[PDB]
Design an enzyme around this catalytic site. Structure first.
Site, PDB file in Angstrom:
ATOM      1  N   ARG E  45       0.816  -1.222   0.000  1.00 35.65           N
ATOM      2  CA  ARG E  45       0.000   0.000   0.000  1.00 35.65           C
ATOM      3  C   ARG E  45       0.847   1.270   0.000  1.00 35.65           C
ATOM      4  O   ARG E  45       1.821   1.381   0.744  1.00 35.65           O
ATOM      5  CB  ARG E  45      -0.969   0.021   1.182  1.00 35.65           C
ATOM      6  CG  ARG E  45      -2.225  -0.802   0.950  1.00 35.65           C
ATOM      7  CD  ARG E  45      -3.336  -0.412   1.909  1.00 35.65           C
ATOM      8  NE  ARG E  45      -3.976   0.857   1.554  1.00 35.65           N
ATOM      9  CZ  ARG E  45      -4.812   1.536   2.343  1.00 35.65           C
ATOM     10  NH1 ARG E  45      -5.120   1.093   3.559  1.00 35.65           N
ATOM     11  NH2 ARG E  45      -5.347   2.671   1.915  1.00 35.65           N
ATOM     12  N   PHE E  50      -0.246  10.349   2.886  1.00 38.82           N
ATOM     13  CA  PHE E  50      -0.831   9.583   3.988  1.00 38.82           C
ATOM     14  C   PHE E  50       0.158   8.547   4.545  1.00 38.82           C
ATOM     15  O   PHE E  50       0.853   8.842   5.514  1.00 38.82           O
ATOM     16  CB  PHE E  50      -2.174   8.957   3.591  1.00 38.82           C
ATOM     17  CG  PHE E  50      -2.929   8.369   4.752  1.00 38.82           C
ATOM     18  CD1 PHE E  50      -3.529   9.192   5.690  1.00 38.82           C
ATOM     19  CD2 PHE E  50      -3.041   6.990   4.906  1.00 38.82           C
ATOM     20  CE1 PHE E  50      -4.222   8.651   6.759  1.00 38.82           C
ATOM     21  CE2 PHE E  50      -3.730   6.440   5.971  1.00 38.82           C
ATOM     22  CZ  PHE E  50      -4.324   7.272   6.899  1.00 38.82           C
ATOM     23  N   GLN E  53       2.340   1.476   3.917  1.00 39.53           N
ATOM     24  CA  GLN E  53       2.378   0.305   4.799  1.00 39.53           C
ATOM     25  C   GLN E  53       3.193  -0.807   4.171  1.00 39.53           C
ATOM     26  O   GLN E  53       3.413  -0.812   2.959  1.00 39.53           O
ATOM     27  CB  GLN E  53       0.974  -0.244   5.073  1.00 39.53           C
ATOM     28  CG  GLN E  53      -0.075   0.771   5.502  1.00 39.53           C
ATOM     29  CD  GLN E  53      -1.484   0.295   5.195  1.00 39.53           C
ATOM     30  OE1 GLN E  53      -2.300   1.055   4.667  1.00 39.53           O
ATOM     31  NE2 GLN E  53      -1.778  -0.969   5.519  1.00 39.53           N
ATOM     32  N   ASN E  92      -3.365  -2.917  11.941  1.00 39.08           N
ATOM     33  CA  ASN E  92      -4.216  -3.913  12.610  1.00 39.08           C
ATOM     34  C   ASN E  92      -5.635  -4.027  12.038  1.00 39.08           C
ATOM     35  O   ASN E  92      -6.080  -3.166  11.277  1.00 39.08           O
ATOM     36  CB  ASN E  92      -4.277  -3.632  14.117  1.00 39.08           C
ATOM     37  CG  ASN E  92      -4.623  -2.188  14.436  1.00 39.08           C
ATOM     38  OD1 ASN E  92      -5.486  -1.584  13.797  1.00 39.08           O
ATOM     39  ND2 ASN E  92      -3.955  -1.630  15.441  1.00 39.08           N
ATOM     40  N   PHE E 103       3.636   0.654   9.114  1.00 40.28           N
ATOM     41  CA  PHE E 103       3.563   1.715   8.107  1.00 40.28           C
ATOM     42  C   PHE E 103       4.281   2.994   8.515  1.00 40.28           C
ATOM     43  O   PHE E 103       4.577   3.212   9.689  1.00 40.28           O
ATOM     44  CB  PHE E 103       2.106   2.022   7.747  1.00 40.28           C
ATOM     45  CG  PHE E 103       1.300   2.583   8.878  1.00 40.28           C
ATOM     46  CD1 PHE E 103       0.675   1.738   9.785  1.00 40.28           C
ATOM     47  CD2 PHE E 103       1.151   3.954   9.030  1.00 40.28           C
ATOM     48  CE1 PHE E 103      -0.075   2.250  10.830  1.00 40.28           C
ATOM     49  CE2 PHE E 103       0.403   4.473  10.071  1.00 40.28           C
ATOM     50  CZ  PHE E 103      -0.213   3.621  10.971  1.00 40.28           C
ATOM     51  N   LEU E 112      -5.745   8.534  13.794  1.00 44.52           N
ATOM     52  CA  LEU E 112      -5.225   7.189  14.014  1.00 44.52           C
ATOM     53  C   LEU E 112      -4.634   7.027  15.415  1.00 44.52           C
ATOM     54  O   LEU E 112      -4.106   5.965  15.745  1.00 44.52           O
ATOM     55  CB  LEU E 112      -4.169   6.857  12.962  1.00 44.52           C
ATOM     56  CG  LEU E 112      -4.600   7.065  11.509  1.00 44.52           C
ATOM     57  CD1 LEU E 112      -3.445   6.721  10.584  1.00 44.52           C
ATOM     58  CD2 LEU E 112      -5.832   6.238  11.167  1.00 44.52           C
ATOM     59  N   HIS E 116      -3.807   2.362  16.589  1.00 48.69           N
ATOM     60  CA  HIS E 116      -2.603   1.644  16.167  1.00 48.69           C
ATOM     61  C   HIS E 116      -1.439   1.841  17.143  1.00 48.69           C
ATOM     62  O   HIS E 116      -1.292   2.911  17.738  1.00 48.69           O
ATOM     63  CB  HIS E 116      -2.184   2.110  14.767  1.00 48.69           C
ATOM     64  CG  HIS E 116      -3.210   1.846  13.706  1.00 48.69           C
ATOM     65  ND1 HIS E 116      -3.317   0.634  13.057  1.00 48.69           N
ATOM     66  CD2 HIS E 116      -4.167   2.643  13.175  1.00 48.69           C
ATOM     67  CE1 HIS E 116      -4.298   0.695  12.175  1.00 48.69           C
ATOM     68  NE2 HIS E 116      -4.831   1.901  12.228  1.00 48.69           N
TER      69      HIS E 116
END
Lengths: 111, 134, 293, 161, 155, 332, 50, 98
Positions: E45, E50, E53, E92, E103, E112, E116
């Site tokens: 990804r 952003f 990952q 997760n 990531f 977030l 995480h």
């Protein structure tokens, strides 16, 4: 007597929690991996089959991207409905549409 | 990297062709003369059967306080102390393993008799429930 | 493997193994029963004659004679070795819907839209018994004993009848709607049953109450008769649905395998007598052999 | 013989203490070298190392013919010492760090075997786990069927009367 | 409190690990890097501004396990947050489902925080994480050229 | 490797018991709550008809009355040996009805043993001595000296050694003398097992202690009795042991080390003497009783007035003998 | 190494014990089925007298 | 420490049983698959003939040091064998002076 018993029981039970869980999970993924991406050729239980994605999820994602579409507008797939069911289904739906335009319920169908 | 007899780091390692295991030449040459067979596998082996191996040689840094005096007195004394008190303590360890062997096999056979005694007990108690119905 | 064999022209209904575990038979709207091998997965005979569509096959327990239940009242009989006709058991005045066979391959039971159950001998060409209820019948099962025959109708009431008495001994209860397939275990000790309420219930043979209501296998507008089976152990239960999914149960009340694959409604799921294989049929003209390693 | 370790999750320490007493009650019922080895075993048993030459280090000036020897001993060993420190310093730390590298090759080989043993040990336990879960189910199947008869046989007899 | 070095097909990335805060998160990561588990894995990804990952052995998206067994619990502290561009954190599938996957943020992510497990921050190779995070992608946010992890070194 | 494989497999086999015990237990309450809602040997028929055929009162002194101990010579059971309240040991011939010897030498005699050679007899007493006698010389050849009363005496299988027990807490082999530090109490009786490798000693605190003669070690202890052990007897079958204490006789299988049968007499009854013929077991004390070992009572005599102190079988059980505080030696 | 040879041995002695565990319960189950198989027949014969 | 074929530090050393020399498994394996021979002596060798390096068995060793009894005894040979040559320097020079 008590010290030797506590060592043997911990040895028997705790040993399979690490490598056997990862090895069986890999063999479960491998059968699913050999099965390809969009065709479950490995006959796994329903609980194990789902397997969620995982990650943070892309935040930008507008309404237009989110749906899975085979052909631009929407996903399209083949169907095998006996035609009589489809014809029977279709008419009932139409009457409801006419009825709203008519604005009349026209009672229920009877004998 | 080590010898498979003394627990040395060999100066002239030699490998046997019946069982792939590196021994120091002096110690394997002594075993063949005592009884002509491989010590580990108990297979037929002779002095001519051995194959000498080569390596980049082993280096020991002789200590900074190295003279004839400590090497004769202090170092050699410690070596025959360390040989003496280890094998005596190792003979003590072998004696207890045989005693703790006897406590193992007796307690094992004691458990066998309990199982055999309870195997007659359980199935006849289950059988009596089967007969009760009648 | 899986093996999705093609062959029929139109909606296939019923597909079953021999008692031995060496063949398939299959046949639906084609008016053609098509025999198969199990272990090089090839066709055999095109059993031709039935002038109505097939609704139920069943091998004779000799693994030679086959019996059909056409939509034109006939129940045919076929020599699977040669592939010739034997008889036309002419009786009912309507569409037959189910068949069942005994140990002794000699007696057969059929179920009409005349609301008539009928027991047949393979030697007379006529009815031995005629049990007239009232609303058109649909599913039937006969026990291993050769004694109890179970009838499934439109009331949701699985009635039980013996061959000696011929009395309404017992009636299963708690099924709101329609029965599409009965199925007695390899013990003779419990039924399976698909209702139109989607409650794939098990029942008792001897006290006679439920055991486990399974729930999660939908019927809808199609109105096909969907099937159920007992696995060779009687551990697993294999019910098909109009959701294109073969819902295998754990018999303890737990869904284990739910495998899709069909593009249309499923009909009669089966199990192989020894090795773990699943025959699954569907209007689609396709059939699978789902395995477990 | 059979006792499932992975499957039996309801085995308490009291059951070990209980079973130990029953095993205890069944136990209440049943109730090459030469001279070298002699002096070596005697030295270890007595806990006394044989005394070495404590002479060379001390000595004394204006002694006699005896200390004339002891003096001349100190010179030759001191010259041998100062020659024994010369050949060490010539190489210096190069000879030491060359042996330090050998010790790192020797160490890493042991921890590779620690892993090989670790993998095959967990691999054997991994095979056992499946066997435990296979049969523990089959035993569960047997007990359910056992309890069914137990009450079935009763409910047949209750009605017969 | 040991660092780790990642060698990719674009450039080298050095990362501090906050092991004092998260002991298990830096026990799992550190063990797999040394073992040769993250070797030859793609950053499956990549999202401009952003994250990027990684940690997928299977190369699917639904892959990767921990050194413990299958999945382990998260360890959140208020000291560690996503305020910056280049922050190592574990991905997760819920509350308590951390696999190997991690990531590297490319911009601040307040939303977030609390979900995480953060367990490190990138020291050197911040140019590589910005250049790696602007690669051509498919509509399924997958890079057109598989950006591999060549070697994972444990410092 | 043998140590590790054993300890693992031991605690593994130990979990078999934990499982087995709880299932066995479940079977009990379930069922409980449901059920709630040799051609010459005299055989039992003939033995059952025995009656008193003689009663001899003149073996021992009239003024110090009572016979306290009895044995028969194993090589000729018509030779009888008795110990008296009168401090004398007597050898008597049943056939001739003659006293062959009156053996004198300082307290009452409470144990006697007849050697198979016929010319050696042995006795013991609260005077703390064991005496070895020549019958033909009517003499004491040895006085073996415990620190207190000797409570039991048994001849070894070889015929060459005597086992003794005592209130001084020791047993002795006469060569070695041993006590249990842990048990530390009076030993009340002693008997060899017939193969001569093991023996039993009863204790004042209700234990039957089994010993290995060669190792001089206490290899098993049989609990379950209450009060002082009074008598023990090993069967010639080599696997039965009968024990008595202050009113039961307990039967032990030495192969299983279990008490498989208990004959419970009334709490007034004193069991003072036990002996197997292995077909029959006799007991004596409050009175004389004989049991068939196969089915566990075939004879019961109450001829003695007051305590019976000894009982024995003649060869092939062709007669029974008993001795009493009433002065008599009786044959049945 | 000690634990390897343990778990190696534990595998071999256990694997044999389970067939014996099951086979016992299998035969134990067969007998239970017989009592079930007969008790029905006496109930079935209640209808014959009626 | 080195592989004799390549000259690298071998990460999987396997010693041959015809020409005693430590080769890297991955390198020597390819040499055997080329032709069944030992690279140094050109004597016949198969892959089963090759043997990985192992811990001896059950006797624990310690690294080669000055303390170790055998290393200390070979040291005292060096002492005397060097001092024996020191005597020749004075025996030979004495035979010129006299």
């Amino acid at each position: 007597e008590n010290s030797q018993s506590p060592n043997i029981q911990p040895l028997l039970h705790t040993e399979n929690l690490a490598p056997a869980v990862v090895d069986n999970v890999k063999d479960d993924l491998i059968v699913s991996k050999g099965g390809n991406s969009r065709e479950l050729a490995r006959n796994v239980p329903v609980n194990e089959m789902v397997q969620p994605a995982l990650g943070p999820a892309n935040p930008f994602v507008t309404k237009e991207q989110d749906s899975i579409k085979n052909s631009i507008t929407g996903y399209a797939e083949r169907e095998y409905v006996p035609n009589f069911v489809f014809n029977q289904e279709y008419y009932a739906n139409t009457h409801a549409i006419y009825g709203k335009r008519n604005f009349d319920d026209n009672e229920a169908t009877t004998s | 990297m080590f010898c498979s007899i003394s627990g040395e780091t060999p100066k002239e390692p030699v490998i046997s062709r019946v069982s792939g295991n590196v021994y120091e030449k002096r110690l394997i040459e002594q075993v063949i003369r005592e009884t002509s067979k491989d010590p580990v596998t108990q297979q037929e082996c002779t002095l001519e059967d051995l194959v000498p191996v080569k390596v980049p040689d082993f280096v020991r840094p002789r200590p900074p306080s190295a003279t004839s005096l400590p090497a004769l007195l202090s170092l050699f004394q410690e070596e025959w102390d360390s040989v003496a008190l280890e094998q005596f303590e190792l003979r003590r360890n072998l004696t207890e393993t045989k005693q703790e062997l006897s406590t193992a096999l007796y307690s094992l056979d004691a458990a066998l008799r309990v199982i055999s005694r309870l195997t007659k007990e359980r199935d006849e108690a289950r059988e009596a429930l089967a007969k009760f119905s009648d | 493997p899986n093996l999705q064999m093609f062959g029929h022209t139109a909606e296939v209904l019923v597909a079953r193994f021999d008692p031995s575990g060496s063949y398939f038979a299959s046949g639906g709207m084609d008016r053609q029963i098509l025999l198969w091998n199990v272990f090089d997965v090839k066709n055999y005979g095109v059993l031709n004659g039935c002038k109505g569509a097939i609704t139920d096959l069943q091998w004779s327990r000799d693994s030679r004679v086959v019996y059909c239940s056409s939509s034109d009242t006939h129940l045919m009989s076929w020599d699977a070795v040669s592939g010739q006709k034997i008889r036309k058991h002419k009786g009912h005045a309507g569409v037959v819907n189910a068949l069942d066979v005994l140990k002794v391959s000699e007696l057969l039971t059929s179920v009409s839209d005349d609301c008539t159950m009928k027991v047949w001998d393979s030697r007379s060409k006529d009815c031995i018994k005629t049990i007239e209820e009232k609303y058109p019948l649909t599913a039937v099962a006969i026990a291993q004993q050769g004694t109890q025959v179970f009838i499934g109708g439109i009331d949701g009431a699985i009635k039980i009848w013996d061959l000696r008495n011929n009395h309404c001994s017992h009636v299963l209860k708690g099924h709101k709607d329609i029965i599409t397939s009965l199925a007695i275990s390899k013990d003779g000790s419990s039924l399976l049953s698909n209702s139109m309420d989607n409650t794939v219930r098990i029942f008792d043979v001897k006290a006679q109450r439920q055991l486990q209501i399974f729930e999660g296998a939908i019927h809808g507008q199609e109105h096909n008769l969907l099937g159920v089976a007992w696995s060779r152990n009687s551990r697993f239960v294999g019910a098909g649905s109009s959701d294109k999914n073969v819902y295998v149960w754990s018999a303890t009340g737990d869904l284990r395998y739910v495998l899709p694959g069909h593009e249309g409604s499923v009909n009669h799921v089966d199990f192989h007598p020894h090795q773990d294989i699943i025959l699954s049929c569907s209007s689609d003209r396709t059939i699978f052999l789902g395995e477990l390693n | 013989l059979d006792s499932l370790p992975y499957f039996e999750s309801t085995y308490n320490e009291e059951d070990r203490s209980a079973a130990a007493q029953i095993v205890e009650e069944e136990l209440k019922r049943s109730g090459s070298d030469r001279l070298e080895n002699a002096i070596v075993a005697a030295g270890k048993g007595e806990k006394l190392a044989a005394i070495d030459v404590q002479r060379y280090i001390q000595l004394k000036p204006p002694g006699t013919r005896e200390s004339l020897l002891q003096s001349a001993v100190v010179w030759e060993y001191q010259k041998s010492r100062n020659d024994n420190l010369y050949l060490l310093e010539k190489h210096g730390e190069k000879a030491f760090d060359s042996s330090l590298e050998a010790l790192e090759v020797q160490l890493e080989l042991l921890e590779k075997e620690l892993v090989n043993t670790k993998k095959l040990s967990q691999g054997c336990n991994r095979k056992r786990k499946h066997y435990q879960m296979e049969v523990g189910a089959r035993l569960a199947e047997a007990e359910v069927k056992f309890g069914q008869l137990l009450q079935s046989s009763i409910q047949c007899r209750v009605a017969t009367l | 409190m040991a660092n780790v070095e990642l060698q990719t097909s674009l450039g080298k990335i050095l990362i501090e690990l906050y092991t004092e805060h998260a002991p298990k998160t830096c026990q799992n990561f550190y063990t797999l890097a040394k073992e040769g588990y993250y070797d030859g894995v793609i950053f499956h990804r990549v999202i401009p501004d952003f994250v990027i990952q990684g940690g997928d052995p299977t190369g699917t998206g639904r892959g990767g396990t921990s050194i413990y067994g299958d999945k382990f619990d998260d360890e959140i502290h208020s000291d560690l947050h996503h305020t910056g561009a280049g922050i190592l954190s574990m991905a997760n599938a819920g509350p308590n489902t951390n696999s190997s996957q991690f990531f590297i943020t490319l911009a601040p992510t307040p939303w977030l925080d609390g979900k995480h497990t953060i367990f490190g921050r990138v020291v050197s190779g911040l140019s590589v994480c910005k250049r790696m995070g602007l690669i051509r992608t498919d509509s399924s946010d997958r890079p057109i050229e598989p950006l591999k992890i060549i070697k994972a070194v444990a410092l | 490797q043998e140590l590790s494989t054993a300890l693992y497999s031991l605690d593994a086999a130990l979990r078999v018991i934990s499982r087995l015990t709880k299932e066995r237990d479940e079977a009990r309450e379930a069922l409980a709550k449901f059920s709630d809602n040799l051609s010459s040997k005299r055989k039992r028929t003939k033995l059952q008809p025995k009656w008193a055929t003689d009663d001899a009162v003149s073996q021992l002194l009239q003024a110090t009355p009572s016979t306290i101990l009895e044995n028969l010579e194993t090589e000729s059971t018509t030779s009888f040996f008795p110990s008296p309240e009168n401090s004398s040991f007597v050898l008597c011939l049943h056939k001739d009805e003659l006293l062959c010897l009156d053996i004198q030498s300082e307290g009452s005699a409470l144990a006697c043993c007849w050697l198979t050679s016929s010319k050696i007899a042995v006795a013991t007493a609260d005077a703390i001595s064991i005496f070895e006698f020549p019958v033909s010389s009517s003499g004491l050849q040895s006085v073996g000296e415990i620190d207190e009363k000797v409570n039991f005496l048994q001849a070894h299988p070889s015929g060459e050694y005597l086992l003794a027990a005592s209130n001084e807490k020791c047993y002795i082999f006469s060569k070695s003398q041993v006590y249990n530090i842990t048990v530390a109490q009076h030993i009340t009786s002693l008997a060899v097992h017939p193969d001569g490798n093991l023996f039993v000693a009863g204790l004042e605190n209700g234990e039957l202690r089994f010993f290995e003669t060669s190792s001089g070690n206490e290899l098993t202890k049989f609990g379950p009795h209450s009060s002082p052990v009074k008598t023990l007897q090993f069967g010639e079958n080599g696997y039965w042991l009968v024990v008595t204490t202050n009113s039961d006789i307990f039967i032990w299988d030495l192969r299983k080390s279990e008490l498989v049968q208990k004959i419970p007499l009334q709490t007034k009854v004193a069991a003072v003497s036990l002996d197997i013929t292995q077909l029959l077991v006799s007991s004596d004390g409050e009175t004389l009783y004989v049991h068939i070992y196969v089915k566990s009572r075939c004879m019961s005599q109450t001829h003695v007035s007051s305590i019976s102190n000894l009982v024995w079988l003649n060869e092939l059980h062709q007669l029974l003998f008993s001795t009493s505080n009433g002065a008599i030696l009786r044959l049945g | 190494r000690k634990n390897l040879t343990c778990y190696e041995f534990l595998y071999n002695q256990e694997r044999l014990a389970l067939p014996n565990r099951l086979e016992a319960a299998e035969i134990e189950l067969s007998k239970m089925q017989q009592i079930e198989a007969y008790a029905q027949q006496d109930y079935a014969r209640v209808t014959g007298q009626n």
